[PDB]
Design a protein around this ligand. Structure first.
Ligand SMILES: CC(C)(C)OC[C@H]1C(=O)NCCN1C(=O)C[C@H](N)Cc1cc(F)c(F)cc1F
Ligand SMILES: CC(C)(C)OC[C@H]1C(=O)NCCN1C(=O)C[C@H](N)Cc1cc(F)c(F)cc1F
Lengths: 727, 725
């Protein structure tokens, strides 16, 4: 009979059970039960202890994560974890020999190691320390330095700089072992001329003088970092002296101007594919290079080049898709936009220029998951024509007309959103269901796709939620200009359309994003609907993804227009449904959602009463180049400079006199710098409009500190409750 | 019957008229008449035009200020004004020859000049460019370079570094001409090992990348800048060889450790007086250095030293007072605390250690204003025993019993707060009345204290103020430990003592500060009382000044204790007065007042419902050394580190759960760095205390921008009105 309180959300009273496993072979995986690392047999479900939970309570340090070598002879323990950016971090590492049950004390991995990674097979080790690459053949023998140009904030070897980590590779690592560990392919980034973003870091109050953090950050139109690619043979490190790292340059179509390295994928033991991207991200080229046995060099024939361009915007969703090569490495499958604007799987020959689409329709393929000699497993939103749904399909390679869905009918009521984790050779796979019901985990056999057992069904959480007045979720669409636009609402319990509720428009609306899906969540919206009786609505307008290039490319070179206007129009549609209080419609958003929310509140529409903007973008010349230029081009007069200045929130400061505005931003935000919100407030002051503000000391773009997280949602809860007059 | 609204205060609807004049001789002064500049004969009042407005309307630049040479033969023009800190600024200059009736176009003063100043007599010229001193014997001639060690952010010649500008000399200038311009004494500051404070500056929206401001800033206990003093003869600048400066070294009692240069005052033409201060600011020594003809050096005989120390706290109010030498330079008068803690004027002899006080009583002399052969003109708060009053007195140097007050009886109703401006030889003097009535400016003659004419009476403003329901002001005191502590209340119009009002506590409570005076003010408090019917009160507890060292030195080494508790005790007695609603009491403060406000809201007294803190101190280890160590010593375990940690507001974050809190601070605050407010918020987040916050981009400690000033007082008004309903 209780509601879902703010305390329940902040104190995490109702936890979603998970089942995170790590496949070590084609029929075995690892799992943590009572902090004991168990090894399971997928065929029969029985397990055995692989590492006791008391083995490392004598360690003296709180182990943050482990990493077992593929051959099972060693395990890398990382401690003193200190987060850096979204993916990068710094920590200490120790190697534990499993054939001796002892810690490695000789030739320990150096402190301040920036990244560690095992080889795909065996137990080789490559790590980045002081921006240089080292390789250890044995965990206890001395290392072999590979790079020598590594310089702080200038030269990156084996690791990415800020932009590449965030906007290109989505990872800190810039290393790529060959399939059997023979070769080590790495990239080198040079941020010599890249300007530095500078902001104060205050740290603990014991620090007398504030600290100044300086990070190479290429803003829109600024000097980008350069990149070089290398491949070194780690087998020659025995008679190493100074091992030679062979360089692979970019095609001539990329050397004419600024470019990026956007994908690295090995095909065979002696074949690696590289995808390059121009700074004008509408033209990318895949390069397939084979290892020359006699020359010791790498050669990429022009006949094996593959160009992927776009005539109505950028190429790919956030980057050119990654290829999935067959066993022989002479052909690959890749997601690309077809002539109708829908992204499907195309079959490429390593030699032929034209590819053949194996899937088609008014829907898109989210990703390729596994490839065997028989079938290719992919995820898509084809089922019931719902762009917000995810299901695992299986397409027959010998006949593209034989497509079977493996998750559509497992539980259509409870499960409409799926992810999959296949075994080493696609013999088994774990299906991850995340909505609209409670999460469900199941194991399966690829021989006939039978359900072996249920790993986790959240039956414990289901019982707790029975005596709780949980909200309901409606997933539907509206029609704007003969086009379906999907939306979702978190409806308060005992929803009655005879009444009129307050409306909170939860907004992100970033390019190729999706806010209306079938995923089940326990977040701030759950509390606002359950306890405060507030409808939390989300709307996927123009610019959202997984619906075709016609919608996703609608905001190309025009950020802050249709995306913003579609959110305002969505509010008008909701109020015209009967159960929305017109004088109590709010809007809030984080990151890109903060930018859209600010542009909405400064549009003079009069639709919204109040609004919250957390870590918002103010003007796009303040954001990084690779992301901004992808959708906005260059901020030069001969290019899209006119809209760079026409789409700032500062230029709408006057309209903020009609709304109640709350601006929040972390002082240590490395992504969307505090500069952005500092310019918003100063513009509002210059025109004399009052607003509420809140900075968070040393919090970054996530404001994920346990105390800060509880403090921000508490502060936003009061602002929303007072705006709606809710006691 | 309208009230004094917030718009009136933010728009300056009712403006006080002043009479800012600058004496050009012993019987004449300059005065600007909107467009041009006039010259007034003090004896008669007739005025001729000195410089027309059209003389520089063909300039091509905006005139920021004027500076006439002492001989009236040149005029220095200030333009391209760019403010730095409280006093420091950079600008361009152009000299205008009054005989040639045109500008000097040769050997002009370089752009980005840091400080300029004429000699006391004649028309010599000393300026500072790129931290190096230059001197022109003639405006249109090449300038001699005295110093060559000038280096930005490290070596300062003729100018003060940040901490010296703010806490020691209260000015950018580190130059001191001799009485007749023969010698040019200057100080050199070295910030080589002084840590730099770094904070981001965002500038205009066009700037794609924020800038990082870096300022040499010695926080509490950090490496302080070193100082050297020099004197150079300006009558013998060789056009071929460099200038040779004679260095005056500090006494041995100061060279044993860290020390400061806290005063420079010339006695005669060949005698200059220096005052040095140990880093532990309770011991100071004055040197009296005479120039040697043949030797060419300066000698400060040991027998001519004068020690000024304190056993109960620091020496001086904020620094040892300046001396006032006689005509022969063989004796001087200065303000020092007597053996009971009350600061009075002492008659010194150059060669004698003991001095004799010429004033006595349980009151303090605020300052010495003029010195003649037979009279000493000073200001004090002796009249009616009111520490919040200021009156001008003259004491006969031949008979210490013949003391006369020159301003007490002029207008006792309107005027209880006076400042003065004497002429070149103190032949005339202008009295500046500040309250409780409207400001009043009058001219007088020293021969018989006649009182010549009325300069400004604000009669035009008085006429308008009769149409607005203006608030009243109550000056009184309460008893704490059998001691009189004064307070003031801005009472709403038609004040009824049977009706209960919301009360706001306007607090500063810095050492040797005073918020309960007779000064008339038109400020945010005037609006809160006239329009919102809010009693805004101020209280001077232990630590306040002008009442003796027993009250001032009470907070020595214990900052954030008694002055914080006495604010709570006073508000407690305010709440139980019948006309104060004890359920609606707030407290707000700025700078040091924000620290006290934060310490009070976190005290757990439960007396206050809400409070506002603007650019407050949160941890004394964050503020600069000269100010902090003057009242707290060093942040070391063997000294006073115990209270440095006990007097933080972060340690009281837990007690903020029962109060509404508004924290405001400017991002570009070079004085009280934003760091201090960033640690307050972070401490409140760690304990889960909700509060209100508001930063201001690129604003400094004053938040004095036109748009920012209006925005903060508008934001604070909504906060107070909401807290009072
Ligand atoms: C997991 C999330 C959080 C969705 O990021 C994933 C990340 C990725 O690695 N792959 C797919 C997409 N993706 C990005 O687009 C990163 C962007 N920089 C996000 C972003 C956009 C803004 F406008 C902004 F102001 C700030 C931002 F942080
Ligand atoms: C009257 C004004 C215009 C304020 O200057 C007076 C200045 C002067 O030159 N002579 C008299 C005393 N005096 C000072 O004490 C400067 C202080 N640093 C002020 C101050 C104190 C703090 F605790 C703080 F956190 C920040 C601050 F700015």
């Amino acid at each position: 009979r209780k509601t879902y309180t703010l305390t329940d959300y902040l104190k995490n009273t109702y936890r979603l059970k998970l089942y995170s496993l790590r496949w070590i072979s084609d029929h075995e995986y690892l799992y943590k039960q009572e902090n004991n690392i168990l090894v399971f047999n997928a065929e029969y479900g029985n397990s055995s202890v692989f590492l006791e939970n008391s083995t490392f309570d004598e360690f003296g340090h709180s182990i943050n994560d482990y990493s077992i070598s593929p051959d099972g002879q060693f395990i890398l323990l990382e401690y003193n974890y200190v987060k850096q950016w979204r993916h990068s971090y710094t920590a200490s590492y120790d190697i534990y020999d499993l054939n001796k049950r002892q810690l490695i004390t000789e030739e320990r991995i150096p402190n301040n190691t920036q990244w560690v990674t095992w080889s795909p097979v065996g137990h080789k080790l490559a790590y980045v320390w002081n921006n240089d690459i080292y390789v250890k053949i044995e965990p206890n023998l001395p290392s072999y330095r590979i790079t020598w140009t590594g310089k702080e904030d200038i030269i990156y070897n084996g690791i990415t700089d800020w932009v590449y980590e965030e906007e290109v590779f989505s990872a800190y690592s810039a290393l790529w072992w060959s399939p059997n560990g023979t070769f080590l392919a790495y990239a080198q980034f040079n941020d010599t001329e890249v300007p530095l973003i500078e902001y104060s870091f205050y740290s603990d109050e014991s620090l007398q003088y504030p600290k100044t953090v300086r990070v190479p950050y290429p803003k829109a139109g600024a000097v980008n970092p350069t990149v070089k690619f290398f491949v070194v043979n780690t087998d020659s490190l025995s008679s190493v002296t100074n091992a030679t790292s062979i360089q692979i340059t970019a095609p001539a179509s990329m050397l004419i101007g600024d470019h990026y390295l956007c994908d690295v994928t090995w095909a065979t033991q002696e074949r690696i594919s590289l995808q390059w991207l121009r700074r004008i991200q509408n033209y990318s080229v895949m390069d397939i290079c084979d290892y020359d046995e006699s020359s010791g060099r790498w050669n990429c024939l022009v006949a094996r080049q593959h160009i992927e361009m776009s005539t109505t915007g950028w190429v790919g969703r956030f980057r050119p898709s990654e290829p999935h090569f067959t066993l022989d490495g002479n052909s690959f499958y890749k997601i690309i936009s077809n002539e109708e604007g829908y992204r499907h799987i195309c079959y490429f020959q390593i030699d032929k220029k034209d590819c053949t689409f194996i899937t088609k329709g008014t829907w898109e393929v989210i990703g390729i998951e596994a490839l065997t000699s028989d079938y290719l497993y992919y995820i898509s939103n084809e089922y019931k024509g719902m762009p917000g749904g995810r299901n695992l399909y299986k397409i027959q390679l010998s006949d593209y007309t034989k497509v079977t869905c493996l998750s559509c009918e497992l539980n259509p009521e409870r499960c409409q959103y799926y992810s999959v984790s296949f075994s080493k050779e696609a013999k088994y796979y774990q299906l991850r269901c995340s909505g609209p019901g409670l999460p469900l985990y199941t194991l399966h056999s690829s021989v006939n796709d039978k359900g072996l057992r249920v790993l986790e069904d959240n039956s414990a959480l289901d019982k707790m939620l029975q005596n709780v007045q949980m909200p309901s979720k409606k997933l539907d669409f509206i029609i704007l200009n003969e086009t379906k636009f999907w939306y979702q609402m978190i409806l308060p319990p005992h929803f009655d359309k005879s009444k009129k509720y307050p409306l909170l428009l939860d907004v992100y609306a970033g390019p190729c994003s999706q806010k209306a899906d079938t995923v089940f969540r326990l977040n701030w919206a759950t509390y606002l609907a359950s306890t405060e009786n507030i409808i939390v609505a989300s709307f996927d307008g123009r610019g959202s993804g997984y619906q075709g290039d016609k919608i996703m490319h609608a905001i190309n070179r025009r950020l802050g227009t249709f995306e913003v206007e579609d959110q305002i129009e969505a509010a008008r549609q909701f109020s015209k449904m009967g159960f929305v209080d017109n004088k109590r419609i709010a809007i809030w958003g984080w990151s890109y959602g903060g930018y859209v929310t600010s542009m909405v509140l400064g549009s003079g529409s009069g639709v919204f009463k109040c609004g919250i903007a957390v870590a918002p973008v103010s003007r796009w010349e303040y954001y990084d180049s690779v992301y901004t230029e992808r959708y906005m081009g260059l901020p030069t007069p001969e290019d899209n400079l006119d809209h760079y200045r026409n789409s700032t929130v500062m230029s709408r400061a006057e309209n903020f006199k009609q709304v109640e505005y709350l601006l929040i931003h972390g002082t240590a935000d490395d992504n969307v710098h505090f500069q952005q919100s500092a310019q918003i407030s100063k513009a509002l002051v210059d025109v004399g409009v009052d607003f509420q503000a809140m900075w968070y000391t040393d919090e970054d773009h996530g404001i994920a500190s346990s105390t800060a997280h509880q403090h921000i949602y508490t502060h936003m809860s009061h602002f929303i409750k007072q705006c709606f007059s809710l006691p």
